[PDB]
Each structure stands twice: as C-alpha cells, then as structure tokens.
Amino acid sequence: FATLGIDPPKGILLYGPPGTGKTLCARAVANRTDATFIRVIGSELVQKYVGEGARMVRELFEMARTKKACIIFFDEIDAVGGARFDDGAGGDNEVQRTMLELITQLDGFDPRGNIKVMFATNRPNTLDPALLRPGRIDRKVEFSLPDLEGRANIFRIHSKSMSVERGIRWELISRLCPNSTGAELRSVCTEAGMFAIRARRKVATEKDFLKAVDKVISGYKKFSSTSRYMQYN
Amino acid sequence: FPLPSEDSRAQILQIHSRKMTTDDDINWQELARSTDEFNGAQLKAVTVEAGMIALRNGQSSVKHEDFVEGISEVQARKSKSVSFYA
Amino acid sequence: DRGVSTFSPEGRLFQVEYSLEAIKLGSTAIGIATKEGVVLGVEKRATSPLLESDSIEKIVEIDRHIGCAMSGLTADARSMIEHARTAAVTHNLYYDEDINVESLTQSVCDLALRFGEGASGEERLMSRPFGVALLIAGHDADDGYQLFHAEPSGTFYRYNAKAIGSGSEGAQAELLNEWHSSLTLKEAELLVLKILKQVMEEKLDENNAQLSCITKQDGFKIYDNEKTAELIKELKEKEAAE
Amino acid sequence: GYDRALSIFSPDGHIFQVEYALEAVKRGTCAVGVKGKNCVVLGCERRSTLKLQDTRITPSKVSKIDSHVVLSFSGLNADSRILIEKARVEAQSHRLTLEDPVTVEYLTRYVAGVQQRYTQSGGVRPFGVSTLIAGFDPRDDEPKLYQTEPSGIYSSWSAQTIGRNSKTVREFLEKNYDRKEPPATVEECVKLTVRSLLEVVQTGAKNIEITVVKPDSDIVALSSEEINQYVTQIEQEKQEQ
Amino acid sequence: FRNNYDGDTVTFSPTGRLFQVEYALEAIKQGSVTVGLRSNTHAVLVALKRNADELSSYQKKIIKCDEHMGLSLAGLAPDARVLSNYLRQQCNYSSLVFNRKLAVERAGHLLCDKAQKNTQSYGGRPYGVGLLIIGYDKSGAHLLEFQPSGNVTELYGTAIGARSQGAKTYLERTLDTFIKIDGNPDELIKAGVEAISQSLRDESLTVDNLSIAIVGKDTPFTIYDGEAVAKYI
Amino acid sequence: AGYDRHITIFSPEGRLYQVEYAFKATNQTNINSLAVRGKDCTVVISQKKVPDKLLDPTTVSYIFCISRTIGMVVNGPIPDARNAALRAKAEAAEFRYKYGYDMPCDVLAKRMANLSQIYTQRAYMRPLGVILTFVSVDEELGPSIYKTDPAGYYVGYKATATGPKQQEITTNLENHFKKSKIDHINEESWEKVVEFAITHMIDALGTEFSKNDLEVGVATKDKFFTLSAENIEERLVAIAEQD
Amino acid sequence: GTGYDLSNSVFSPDGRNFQVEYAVKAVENGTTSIGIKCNDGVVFAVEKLITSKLLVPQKNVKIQVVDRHIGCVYSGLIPDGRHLVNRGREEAASFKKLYKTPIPIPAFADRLGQYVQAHTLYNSVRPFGVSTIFGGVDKNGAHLYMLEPSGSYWGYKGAATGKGRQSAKAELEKLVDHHPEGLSAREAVKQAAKIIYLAHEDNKEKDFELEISWCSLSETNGLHKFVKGDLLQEAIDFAQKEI
C-alpha cells in the first residue's frame, strides 16, 4: 500500500450474532501474524477502585510502543461503551469514563498509534453512538448466517474429523437444518457420535443424522436458545 | 460546530487525497453532492476504502469507481450484508 | 418489541425481512411454465407414515384456467386464496370475462403490506403480513401461459421456471441449464419429477408429492395418484441411460 | 379497543405467539383417538391430581358439535369454549344458509380458518388449544378424523394423539396399528385406544373418558363400568404375554 | 445505529433530524436507478428495470396516470402503487368535478399531503419509494422529484436510484442543450440514454432493461417497452 | 421499569411525579403577579416583561378576557396559557345558551378545574403547565378570586399571587390583613384599589416599574376592562406624590 | 429516570419539554426567512438556498398565501410547513362561510396556535418542527405574527428565523431606530432585500434566491402578491450596492 500512498485502517469492527465463533476468527489471525497478541476482557478494564480503570487503558497502549507490530483484542465492550448520560441510577459515571480514556488513548490530540485495535461484543446497538462512527474504525464486517452453500462447508471441515460413512451427502443435512449460528452447526457432528452407544450403532450413519435433526435442532429449540433471538437487548 | 455543508465537503475530500495517487480526472464537487450530512472522519474514511479497492483489483492508481464503490460499502450511514433486491 | 411500521437501517420493514426467511422453513414448491402448459408441483413432506395423502393440499384452484401453489406456512395461504378467489370470481361478474393472471396477482399482493396499528385515513386491521409464498399460474387469450410469484414484500415477477421454499437456492440454479423455450408438456412433467426426486429425503412417490397442470382446453387439472405413479416409473428409465 | 399487534415474526422466521402457544397443549391432558372402517373412537383423559369431582355434573371432555360429529380437544380450557360455541352456531348457520347438514371436512377447515383470523388479527392472541374433529359425513360411512393445530394447519390422520406424552403414544400407534388394514369392528377400536392410555393415565379408571362415534347420528358414551371392562381384558393379555 | 432515539416516529433527534425519514430515504438510493429530463414542449422519462434472475421478467418501473402525464418509481414497488392510486384519484376528481386535467404543480402539493399524515402520526410510515412526476399543461412541461418526507421541487431533470446521483454529471454539462431543443423528440430521448449509461457498471442497457416514456404537447404519454426502445439504444 | 416517572401513576411513595413537575413549569417565564379583592370590585395586577423591542406592547398580555363579566390572569408559558383560555371561553358560552344567564366566577374556576382533573387521571394526556387565576364580581357573594391549580384543585383566596417570589409577596399581603383584621380593602373607589396593589408590589420587588412594565386588570360589577398605557401611567403619578 | 426525551407528553424534571427543544434545532437547519411590518401593511421576504444548477429559476413559490389577505412563509422542514397552511386554509374557508367577511390577522393566529398545541398534548403525534411567519392587512391597521414550534407567539414588528436568524433578525433592531415614526411599503421592499444579503455571510457557500411579497392598502389594497417586473430587479441593485 506504500505505492498508492494510502492509510491502512487502524481499527476494525466485528460484532455479529452470538454463536458464530467470532472469537475463533480473532485467534486465527494471531496464528498467521506470528507476533504478540493481547486479549482484553471488557470486565477487566473496570477495577475495584474509581479511577484505576483509567490507568488500565494506558497499560495496553504502553506495550504498543514498547512492542511493535502486535495485536490487541477487546472482548464484550458492551459492558463498557455507551453514553448512558446522567439522570440514571447515578453509579454509571465510572464506566463511561473508561471509553473517554480509551478514545483519548486511541485518537487524542496527538495521533499516536501503531498496531491494530479490535472491538468486539454481542450488542452493537447498546454501544456509544460515537463509538459506532468511523475515524477510530474503518473496516466494518458483520457476521451472517451461512446459506445452503455456506452451511455445507461447515460440515466439510468437520468431515475430516470424527467418522464419516462413505456415500453420505452432507448437503441434505444442512438443508433440513434451518438457519442457525455455527455454534448449533458443530453440535450436529458432536452429538452424532453420542448415538453410537444408546442407539446401537458402530459409526455415525445417515439414520443417526436424521435423528439429530429432531434432537440437535428441533429438540433443543424450546427456550433459552439464542441464535437470532436476541439481536438488540 | 455542526456537520459540514455541501460544497465544504468537496474541499475536505481533496485535502486527504494529497498523499494518494490518482489521475486527477475525478470531480470532487460531484463526490460531495453524493454525501449527505457525513462526519469529517467519515469523509477521510472514504479515501481509506478507495485505496483498498484498487489493491484487490490490482490497479496502479485510484480511479473514479474506487470512491463510488466505497460509498456502496460501509462508510457513513450505509450498511448492507446482502444484495436483497426484489 | 416495536411497531410493524418501523424501518430497518437498510431501508426496509422488519416485518418484510423476517417474512421472506419463513419461506425456506417450509416445504419446497417447484413449477415450470412452458408454451404448451404450466406444470406445477409441491411436496407434502409427511413426518409420519400415518398421514393421509388427501390431508395437506398445497395446490388450490382459483379458476378453471388459473391455478396456484403454496409453500412454507400454509396458515397465511388459506386466507389469501379466499381473497384471491374473491378478486377473481367477483371480477367475472363485473366485466363478464376472465380476470388477467397479471391483474389478479396485483390485487392479491396489495393485501400484504396494508397491515399496521391504527392506520389513518381508513380501516385496515391486520396483525402481520402473510408469511407464505404463492406461485400464480394461468393462461389467457393474449399473453399466454404465465407463472408469477407472490412475495410477502408486495412484489411479483414472471418466472418461466421457479423453485421456492427450501429449494430456492440449490434447486433454483439447477433449472437454468435444464430449461428451454421448446420444452413441451410431456417433457416438462419428467423434468420437475427429476428435481423433486433428488431434493426429497426418501424415494419419490404419489403420497409425498402432488403435481398439477394448467392447459388451454382442460384448464386446471390435478394428476391422479395412478397418473403420477406412471410418470415416476418413466423417470427411473431416464435416470439410468449410459 | 386494543389495536396493538401481538404475533410478530421472529428473526428465525417463526412466530413467538405460535411456538410458545404450542407448549400449552403439551402441558395439558393427552387426547388420543383412532378410526376404524365402520366406527371412530376418541379417547380422552382427565386430571388425576384433583379429586371429589362428580362425573355427571362435570361437562364432558368431548364436546358434541353435531349429531354425526363431535370434538375432543387438548389444551387451554379457556380458549376451547370460544371454539366450541362458534363451531356449533356455524353448524346451525350452515343448515340455515345452504340448507345442508355440515360435513366433517367443512367443520375442520372452518375451525382452522377461524384460528387463522386471530393469528392475523391485530389485538387478539391465537388459541392455545388443539382440537380433534371426528365424525361421519351425511349419507357417507367413510371415517373422517381431522387434526386442528393452534397454528391453523389441519390434516387427516388414521391414528393421532396430542397433549403430554404424545411422542410416546405416536410411536406405539405406528407399529401396533396399521393404516392399510384398519379394524372393521367396534370392540377392536375401543381396545386399541385403551392400550394407548396405559402409558399415560398410569393405572386409573375415573380419569378415563372414551367416546364412541358411529354413523347415522349414533353416539354411545362408555360409562365408568364399561371402560373398565375393556381394561381388565387387556391387562390379562399384557403381563401374561 | 438501529433504534435509539427516532425509532419511534413521533420522536425528534437531538441533532434536529429524523432517522425514520433517513431510513426511508436510503431505500431509494439502494433501489432501481432511473433518470429523467424535460424540455419546453416535451419531457423524457428513462427508467432501468432489474430482477433477481435471468429467466424472470422485469417489473415495470413506470406507472401511467393519464394520457397527459406519467411517473416513475425508484424504491419499494407496492408502496408506489398506493401513492399512484391517490394521484390517479385526483386526476379523475378534477376531471369529473372541475372538468380539468390535474396540473403537475398541484399534483405535487396533493401528493405531499398524503405522506405528511403518516410522518406526523404514530402507527403510520412514510413511503420509501421515489416518484418523478412528468406531464404537460398549458403552461409547459414540468418535472418533480418526490422524497419519503414529501418534499416537492421542480427541476429540469434528476436521477434517483443506485449510483443515480453520480449520473447527474452528464445532465449538468448538457443542461444548456436539451432545454433549447424543441420539436426534436428523438434527440431528447437519446439524451436520457447517455445520462443513465454513466451509472451502468455490471450490465448495460438492453431491450428488456431499457424503459422509456415520453410526454409532450402533440404527443401524449406513451410507455415504450420491448423492441420500441431498441432503436434508441 | 423506569417508565413509572414518565406518566401519571401511583408512586411507591404515594405521590404523583408528573404533577410535581407541572407546578415547576410556571416558573420558566418568571412573571410575578398578584390579585386583591376590593370593596365593591376586584383589581388584578401583573408584571409586563417584553424581552425584545420588536414585540408590540399592545399584543403581548398575560391577562385575558374570558367574558364581559369575568377576567383571567395566567402564569407560565403562553402556549399552555392560551390553550385553556379558549377552553374557558367555550364553557362560558355553553352556559349562557343552554343553562341560563351569564356565568359567575366560581363556576368557571370549577369547570376548568374538573376538566384538568380528567386530563390528569388519564395517562394519555399531559397536565397543563400553567395556573388559571380567575377574577370577577359575583352578584351574590360579591368580589371573589379563585385560583385553579394545574393539579385540578381549586380553592378561594383573599389576596393571591403567583410566581417564584409568591412566597415573598404573600408575606406583604398577609401582614397587612393581620394588623387591620380585615378580609378585603375598605376603599370603595376602584382607582385607589389599583394604586393599593401597585404600592405593595414595588416595595416587595424593590423595583420601580413603568407604563409598559405593568398590566393592571380591573374587574367591576358586570363589567371588565384592561387599563391602557395612559391609565396605568396615571396611577404611578399619584403614588409618587402621596408616598 | 431515563427516557424523558423520548416521547412528547413526558415533562422534564425542570418543567420543560425535550421534544419541543429538539424541534427548535430543526428550524435553524432550513432556509432563513425575514419579515417587515409597516403602517399600511407587512412585507415578506425569504432566501431560498439553491442546491445545484438543476433548479428552475423563479418557478418555485415557498410562500403559501391564505385567501388574498394572508401570506405565510416558513423556515424549517418543508413537509411540516405545508401542513400548517393547509390546516389554516380550511379554517379560513370555514370562517368565511359562517362569519362572512374574511378573517383578520390577529384572529387567524389563534387557529394555528391551538392546532399546534394539540400536537404537544398527545404521544401519538409530534409537534411541528417548522416556524411559520404569517401576516397581512386586517380590518383595523395591520399585524404580524411568528408561530414557534412551542406554539408561543405574539405581535412582532419584525420576524426572522433560520440559519441567519442571529444575523438578519439582529439587523431589524436598526430598522426601528432608522424609521421610528413609520416606514413606507415601497421602501420596505428594498430594505428587505438588504437584510437578506447582510445575513448572506453564512449562505455564501451556496447559491441563493430572492423572493419578496408584500400586501398593503396603499397600492394592492388587500392583495397579497409576489414582487415581479422591474420592481424586484430595482431592489436587488439597491441592496447589492452596500455589499
């Protein structure tokens, strides 16, 4: 990119629905990078004292200048971000100052930055409307549910593992399964091995795959099943 | 200090492109009219995506369609995860 | 938890976007419109062997020369057919003729998005838009055989070969190279069953699938279980060739 | 009145007011029924927790819509009284408008069609009860058994059960009962329903109510002593075999 | 984004804007692209038709009102049919009651009164489809541009749709050309073809894609479809 | 469940939150006024504040005339003030045609109070952010002043007032009635009653007003009128001469 | 609590409304408009910002005239500005039906006043975020009024609101000291064009348009019409001479 003379995006945006394995994509980048990786929990920034969370922000950016070409990753930022204003319970003013310390350390009066910053959470709607605007972030990617062609590759990467009977078409299994997150997609291959005990089977067959449709999917719907249920609050 | 006006965004987009490489055939007053009430950083973010588009297509310089496709992508008040035309 | 008129940031209604996803949750309806006739078919998808073949009827009759099929949730389909037959049979009384297939589609699709809470200017009572997809077929004396698609979004297109439901992606792309303008009525019957056999769990029979036909003379006609079984036996000879 | 909508499409494509309403049927009393060639039998259970309930003064669990067809539901009892009353008024309204006795096919599509309205009507909630309509059409001896789901989808079934422990009875009716060779006698149709109630009622008598449907507008309700007569004959051939 | 302040139609944003109006406005920019222009004695309307499949047909983007006037839609198709019924009703209202044809200037004010009722009252929604009103009267040809808010402004020509704002470059340089061209309907139609061609990227103009409807003094409103526009490509 | 404070419902403390904020809306304009009961009539005064020179002094008034026999003065924002003004004029007309002769003062304050009570009980209507104060002369009880609260509670007052300084102004009118042990001014002429209330207002606020800084309403028996600029300025001449 | 700024009828803890305050910010985002009141009549002027060259010159009329005696100009959202005149058009038609002779200026202000008040009393509707300036020649003298989003209005010797509200309206104070005795209707037309250019400093980034309309008894004699011919071009050269 030095030939065109452009500016690579400093931050990125990954939120998506819960259950798509977004944290797995963050670890896949650290493998190819072969450098220092930093995973930050949203609840870790808030300490047991008022004002200590402001020092916790500079602890992360101090290693950026000390250790060059590293990666920082924030997890569950919804517990931190958002304006939340004033008139509420009144104990909310301590958390809103963490982002104001984080934004200042990211883009301040002096544009000091090197590495890439990753913000991730399950609730993009509850965040700061300033945090949802660019200039701290450029690339914005939101995960979606794989289609019939997309869900087929989910069972293909798992087909090399476990035990797959020769002559079984995985495109029919992902087709009977409705649209769902990758968390429930990998549960089909895992539970299929459980039928080798009670159902009196050697390996996972096509019959055990059809029983998993009414079990892994239809049986586990009930309540407390997220997928696309909670997109907002 | 409200949002920038119409003709004011034409001068802002031109300044952030001084470090880039183009053919100078792009009308900056035309791109400003395609932007309705966008933040100042949202204006500079368009030039960031315009450079990334030419890297995928292998172009040696940023052309007109790079800034136009950047608006179709996610920059300011534009989000699409699928075509969805019916 | 919001109003049905609330727009999404993409510029669409939440009731419209989530209604299109309910099409794949149901059965698969496939049909092909040719110059000699329109061959329509559906899939009953029996979950138990004790289900009767006369139980679920996904192909109804609006007119002798006009017919349609349904897919997905059939709860919203029965209500639309009552209004579809109303906008059709009553239209015969007004102009003393048969209503156009494209004109009938407009009257049916306009009843989708009229929902709301406390709609001003008139009385419109609906809780939710229809989450069912209908393939409207028919024949006239001017344009000929046409096959439309009634979407929950209020839009309709004329499809020569259309596959909705769970086959809206894999089974839809297979009809691109298998369709031709010279396709006859007899060859279209074996082409639909060829696609329905590969997309069905168990083997293809008359109990798990029901096909219909629309011609100029006979009009709307439903294939008998004995007539369907004869076309299935002829399909097995076409599967094994070389 | 209340103009606010209730049923809303879930992001998965389903409806919350539908799926959550189906759980009320699974928590209710199981209603199982079968149909033979010349006869149709509809069984129903009651609540075994409550006692001191007189059978005579208690309304029957199987509601009679017409002389030739009855209705045995399972689900919320608050939403069932709305369907029973409106189905009987339409039964007389059909005799008034068309001067024709109602048919089991028309009665099922009407009740299922009315349920489709409340799902599509803003301000009301769907019914949380599922009804089973079984009877005989006028001048027809063919058995008619139709299932009515709270979602509005209706279908015909040879042997079908709803309510609690439904999947247990459904697996029993597939292997034991055959749709190709149904029993042509009334006694075999009654004993078949009792076998399906042994895994749910779990050794009870006064909580079992069986309604026999016969053509030519003939309905014979089995009393408490008549139901236990078929139970004894089955238990002797159960443990010994 | 999503719903924070203006998610309720009766709520105003702290910045003095309305997101519901902005949500429906973005529906036109992501819809089908169309252009238009007019002259003293004539007016030309060019629209592009798309679809989701090659075997599928193309839904007409031009709705006819009367012989002396017409319109085009960019946005949700069924939302324009409701507004078209209110416009055609006023055409027959002035024809029966006043024995006059509905003027283009008065048609924009009556169309604005329909959209303002849904925006100022809860339970309704603004129409997210645009309408370009063309017609002719004793005064001359007039063109209008409808927005989801209901703004009506007379223009020589404009474009609404996908990449439509970028296609206005040809209309600005030629603004002094077609306004002085009278009695040449063939050149005025070809002027709109070169304007919409600037927004073409994937597919170009074809027989079924191109839809042109011209209106004028001696020539009434006529929709040219199929091979009628093949000579103007 | 933070929506309990946004509408009118029973609070866990046994109070109404939206009603408490209705009284606070009258202090936004910060307009001080008072009303006293004379002998045979009633005279009300108000502080006239014109922020910009572009405003016409004749058009700007805080005292509205409901009918010929009844005057009105309202504190707080004008939009909620004139909202109940046209509603009070409609009730005075319906009482003349349907019920009988001209409406007295107590009936107008009672009907407007009961009208606000319905708006307060029903949750889809917000209460008025102003205070209705009616002055007139009855043919039976004589001069009377009824001040209608935005909560829908009306009660009679001897000498009332309004504004954030009302508590400091009430002390002036209260201490005068304790020494003389009288419930009304014994001056028969209405001209001396006008200069009476103005004298106590200047000493309380510590500000000498002008002809355009005050609006003095005068309610006589079966007649009501508003003093012009020359009539108000004439009263200030004799005040400086006597005291 | 939280959400006091969400709906309409919810009061703030200090006794104000957020939705009313948010509607004021929408007034300053539109095209500015001014006004001038004289003895014979009033003069209306508005600066229409031209976006691109696609606009057709002088074919757009922003001022919507009520009958012949009332012009109406608004600064704010265009859809919300047309609904007020359409509502006032029916009020003027309903008045002239029963009441014969046309409605005067101070009477027409009450119809738009109460109608906006009803929108602030309901949670199902929103208040008007546009400020409409209306006036004309009534039966006695003349009057000028400016309707605010809050419904508050009074008599104005001049009214200006928009992007140049801090500039154009600030110049109206010099007009009072310039002609304290009175101003002719013909001279007010040339003075209205100068005020547009004095506030044009913030509008120099775009293209403008000048539309002036006046009504008085000296020439038009109760006819509200726009300025055309050489009279409009004469006021442009006189206004641009000092620029």
* DSSP-derived 3-state class of residue D180: coil
* CA nearest neighbour of D2 among C118, F4, F125: C118
Please count the structural domains in chain D.
Answer: 1
Question: Measured between CB atoms, does D10 come within 8 Å of chain A?
Answer: yes
- Tell me which chain C residue has its CA closest to the CA of residue D120: C127
Q: Which two tokens stand for residue F132?
A: 């209705």
Q: Residue A149 contacts by C-beta under 8 Å, 6 or more apart in sequence? A: C169, C170
How far apart, in whole angstroms, are the C-alpha atoms of residue G189 and residue G44? Answer: 8
Q: Which of G2, G31, G120, G161 is catalytic?
A: G31
Pairing label, strands A139-141, A11-14: parallel
Burial annotation D17-53 (CB, 10 A radius, 16+ → b, else e): bbbebbebbbebbbbbbbbbebbbbbbbbbeeeeeee
**At C90, which CATH number?**
3.60.20.10
Set of chain F residues whose Cβ sits within 8 Å of the Cβ of G10: 6-7, 18, 126
Please count the structural domains in chain C.
Answer: 1
Residues forming beta bridges with residue F134, ordered by sequence position: F72, F146
- Tell me which chain G residue has its CA closest to the CA of residue A88: G1
Residue F4 Cα distances to F16, F18, F81, angstroms:
10, 10, 27
**Surface-to-core class of residue F100, CB atoms within 10 Å of its CB (0-12 exposed, 13-18 middle, 19+ buried):** exposed
In one-letter notation, the amino acid at residue C1 is D
Torsion angle in degrees (nearest 10) through CA of F3, F5, F11, F14: -170
The Cα of A168 is separated from the nearest Cα of chain C by a number of Å equal to 12
- Tell me which chain B residue has its CA closest to the CA of residue G25: B2
How far apart, in whole angstroms, are the C-alpha atoms of residue E185 and residue E190? Answer: 9
With an 8 Å Cβ cutoff, are D13 and A178 in contact?
Answer: yes
Residue G170 DSSP code? G
* CA nearest neighbour of A232 among G124, C113, E118, C6: C6
- Tell me which chain A residue has its CA closest to the CA of residue C27: A176
DSSP secondary structure letters along E176-229? HHHTT--S-HHHHHHHHHHHHGGG-SSS---TTTEEEEEEESSS--EEE-GGGG
Structural resolution in Å: 3.8
Q: Residue E129 contacts by C-beta under 8 Å, 6 or more apart in sequence? A: E27, E28, E31, E73, E74, E75, E76, E77, E79, E80, E83, E148
* DSSP-derived 3-state class of residue E160: strand
Q: Which two tokens stand for residue C171?
A: 């089974």
Q: Which two tokens stand for residue E181?
A: 């061209």
* DSSP-derived 3-state class of residue B54: helix
> Can you count the helices (H) and strands (E) in chain G?
7, 7
DSSP secondary structure letters along A21-57? -HHHHHHHHHHHHTS-EEEEETTTSS-SSSSHHHHHH
How far apart, in whole angstroms, are the C-alpha atoms of residue G109 and residue G113? Answer: 6
Pairing label, strands A11-14, G143-147: unpaired
Residue D58's CB is within 10 A of a number of other CB atoms, namely 10
Q: Which two tokens stand for residue E136?
A: 């002719």
How far apart, in whole angstroms, are the C-alpha atoms of residue E105 and residue E98? Answer: 16
* CA nearest neighbour of G62 among B33, E141, E119, E109: E109
* DSSP-derived 3-state class of residue G207: strand
Q: From the annotation, which residues of A make up the binding site for ATP?
A: 16-23
How far apart, in whole angstroms, are the C-alpha atoms of residue D133 and residue D108? Answer: 7
Burial annotation D176-200 (CB, 10 A radius, 16+ → b, else e): ebeeeebbeebeebbbbbbbbbbeb
Secondary structure of chain F as H, E, C letters: CHHHHCCCCCCCCCCCHHHHHHHHHHHCCCCCEEEEECCCCEEEEEECCCCCCCECCCCCCCEEEEECCEEEEEECCHHHHHHHHHHHHHHHHHHHHHHCCCCCHHHHHHHHHHHHHHHHHCCCCCCCCCEEEEEEECCCCCEEEEEECCCCCEEEECCEEECCCHHHHHHHHHHHHHHHCCCCCCCCCHHHHHHHHHHHHHHHHCCCCCCCCEEEEEEECCEEEECCHHHHHHHHHHHHHHC
Secondary structure of C95-119 as H, E, C letters: HCCCCCHHHHHHHHHCCCCCCECCC
Angle, alpha carbons F214-F220-F225 (nearest 5°): 45
For residues A179 and A142, the answer to whether their CB atoms sit within 8 Å is no
* CA nearest neighbour of G213 among G133, G112, G95, G108: G133
Pairing label, strands C29-33, G41-47: unpaired
Set of chain G residues whose Cβ sits within 8 Å of the Cβ of B33: 52
**Surface-to-core class of residue G223, CB atoms within 10 Å of its CB (0-12 exposed, 13-18 middle, 19+ buried):** middle
The Cα of B10 is separated from the nearest Cα of chain G by a number of Å equal to 11
Pairing label, strands E62-66, E222-224: unpaired
DSSP secondary structure letters along B2-25? ----HHHHHHHHHHHTTTS-B-S-
Sign of the torsion formed by the C-alpha atoms of A172, A173, A178 and A180: negative
Q: Which two tokens stand for residue A41?
A: 């929990």
Q: Residue G177 contacts by C-beta under 8 Å, 6 or more apart in sequence? A: none
Q: Which two tokens stand for residue E39?
A: 């002259």
What domain range includes position C45? 1-242
For residues E21 and E149, the answer to whether their CB atoms sit within 8 Å is yes
Which uninterrupted H or E stretch holds A13? strand A11-14
Which uninterrupted H or E stretch holds D131? strand D129-136
Residue A136 Cα distances to A58, A71, A140, B15, B68, angstroms:
17, 16, 11, 19, 22
How far apart, in whole angstroms, are the C-alpha atoms of residue E8 and residue E20? Answer: 8
How far apart, in whole angstroms, are the C-alpha atoms of residue A183 and residue A185? Answer: 5
- Residues counted in chain F: 243
Nearest to E20 among C7, C106, C160 (CB): C7
State the angle between helix axes of B40-57 and B64-72 in degrees (0 to 180), rounded to the nearest 10. Answer: 120
Please provide residue G212's backbone torsions phi and psi, each rounded to the nearest 5 degrees.
Answer: -125, 135
Q: Which two tokens stand for residue C241?
A: 């060739």
**At D52, which CATH number?**
3.60.20.10
Which uninterrupted H or E stretch holds E152? strand E152-154
Q: Which two tokens stand for residue E175?
A: 């603004």
**At G220, which CATH number?**
3.60.20.10
Which uninterrupted H or E stretch holds A196? helix A195-198
With an 8 Å Cβ cutoff, are E122 and C118 in contact?
Answer: yes
Q: Which two tokens stand for residue D172?
A: 């029993």
* CA nearest neighbour of D163 among D41, D31, D73: D31
Residues forming beta bridges with residue F117, ordered by sequence position: none
How far apart, in whole angstroms, are the C-alpha atoms of residue G98 and residue G89? Answer: 15
Residue C90's CB is within 10 A of a number of other CB atoms, namely 10
Please provide residue G238's backbone torsions phi and psi, each rounded to the nearest 5 degrees.
Answer: -70, -35
Strands of chain G (E only): list them: 33-37, 41-47, 70-75, 131-136, 143-147, 210-216, 225-226
What domain range includes position D126? 1-240
With an 8 Å Cβ cutoff, are G54 and E149 in contact?
Answer: no
Q: In chain D, which residue ranges form alpha helices assigned H by DSSP?
A: 16-26, 77-97, 104-120, 166-176, 186-197, 224-239
Please provide residue G50's backbone torsions phi and psi, each rounded to the nearest 5 degrees.
Answer: -90, 125
Question: Measured between CB atoms, does B5 come within 8 Å of chain G?
Answer: yes
* CA nearest neighbour of F21 among F134, F135, F151: F151
Residues forming beta bridges with residue D221, ordered by sequence position: D211
For residues C75 and D151, the answer to whether their CB atoms sit within 8 Å is yes
For residues F47 and F29, the answer to whether their CB atoms sit within 8 Å is no
For residues G188 and G43, the answer to whether their CB atoms sit within 8 Å is yes
With an 8 Å Cβ cutoff, are G9 and F124 in contact?
Answer: yes
Residue C185's CB is within 10 A of a number of other CB atoms, namely 14
* DSSP-derived 3-state class of residue G42: strand
Residue D138 Cα distances to D90, D100, D133, D193, angstroms:
17, 9, 15, 25
Pairing label, strands D40-45, D208-214: antiparallel
Set of chain C residues whose Cβ sits within 8 Å of the Cβ of A172: 201
Secondary structure of G64-108 as H, E, C letters: CCECCCEEEEEECCHHHHHHHHHHHHHHHHHHHHHHCCCCCHHHH
For residues E31 and E74, the answer to whether their CB atoms sit within 8 Å is yes
Please provide residue A111's backbone torsions phi and psi, each rounded to the nearest 5 degrees.
Answer: -70, 75
How far apart, in whole angstroms, are the C-alpha atoms of residue A217 and residue A221? Answer: 6
With an 8 Å Cβ cutoff, are D12 and A231 in contact?
Answer: no
How far apart, in whole angstroms, are the C-alpha atoms of residue B61 and residue B58? Answer: 9
Specify whether domain E3-233 bears CATH 3.10.270.10.
Answer: no
For residues C229 and C206, the answer to whether their CB atoms sit within 8 Å is yes
Pairing label, strands A37-41, A71-75: parallel
* DSSP-derived 3-state class of residue A229: coil
Residue F152 Cα distances to E122, F74, F131, F132, angstroms:
29, 15, 10, 10
Question: Measured between CB atoms, does C9 come within 8 Å of chain B?
Answer: yes
State the angle between helix axes of G78-99 and G105-120 in degrees (0 to 180), rounded to the nearest 10. Answer: 130
Taking every pair of Cα atoms in chain F, the longest distance, rounded to a whole number of angstroms, is 64
Q: How far apart are the first and last CA of chain A?
A: 40
Pairing label, strands E152-154, E210-216: unpaired
What's the number of CA atoms in the CB half-sphere (13 Å) around residue C52?
Answer: 17
Q: Which two tokens stand for residue D233?
A: 């004959």
Set of chain D residues whose Cβ sits within 8 Å of the Cβ of C132: none
Pairing label, strands D129-136, D69-75: antiparallel
Q: Which two tokens stand for residue E125?
A: 């929604």
For residues A181 and A19, the answer to whether their CB atoms sit within 8 Å is yes
Chains in contact with D, where contact means 3 or more Cβ–Cβ distances below 8 Å, are A, C
Q: Which two tokens stand for residue F229?
A: 């600029």
Sign of the torsion formed by the C-alpha atoms of E79, E84, E85 and E86: positive
* CA nearest neighbour of G35 among G139, G167, G157, G209: G157
- Residue G220 falls in the annotated catalytic set: no
* CA nearest neighbour of A223 among F84, D32, D20: D20
> Which domains, from first to last, does chain F contain?
2-242 (3.60.20.10)
For residues D227 and D208, the answer to whether their CB atoms sit within 8 Å is yes
Strand order in the sheet with E222-224: E34-38, E42-48, E210-216, E222-224
Angle, alpha carbons G129-G130-G131 (nearest 5°): 130
In one-letter notation, the amino acid at residue G229 is G
How far from chain centre, in Å, is Cα E128? 12
* CA nearest neighbour of D176 among D160, D163, D157, D195: D195
How far apart, in whole angstroms, are the C-alpha atoms of residue G17 and residue G8? Answer: 7
Q: Which two tokens stand for residue F191?
A: 């001209």
Q: Which two tokens stand for residue D210?
A: 């069986």
Please provide residue A25's backbone torsions phi and psi, each rounded to the nearest 5 degrees.
Answer: -70, -30
Sign of the torsion formed by the C-alpha atoms of E168, E174, E175 and E180: negative
Residue C131 DSSP code? -
Burial annotation A180-215 (CB, 10 A radius, 16+ → b, else e): bbbebbbbbbebbeebeeeeeeeebbeebbebbbeb
* DSSP-derived 3-state class of residue G33: strand
For residues C100 and C140, the answer to whether their CB atoms sit within 8 Å is yes
Q: Which two tokens stand for residue G22?
A: 């948010």
Sign of the torsion formed by the C-alpha atoms of A159, A160, A161 and A167: positive
The Cα of G5 is separated from the nearest Cα of chain E by a number of Å equal to 8
How far apart, in whole angstroms, are the C-alpha atoms of residue B42 and residue E208? Answer: 38
For residues A124 and A153, the answer to whether their CB atoms sit within 8 Å is no
Residue D200 Cα distances to D161, D164, D210, angstroms:
12, 8, 14
For residues E47 and E31, the answer to whether their CB atoms sit within 8 Å is no
How far apart, in whole angstroms, are the C-alpha atoms of residue G73 and residue G57? Answer: 19
What's the number of CA atoms in the CB half-sphere (13 Å) around residue C93?
Answer: 5
Please count the structural domains in chain G.
Answer: 1
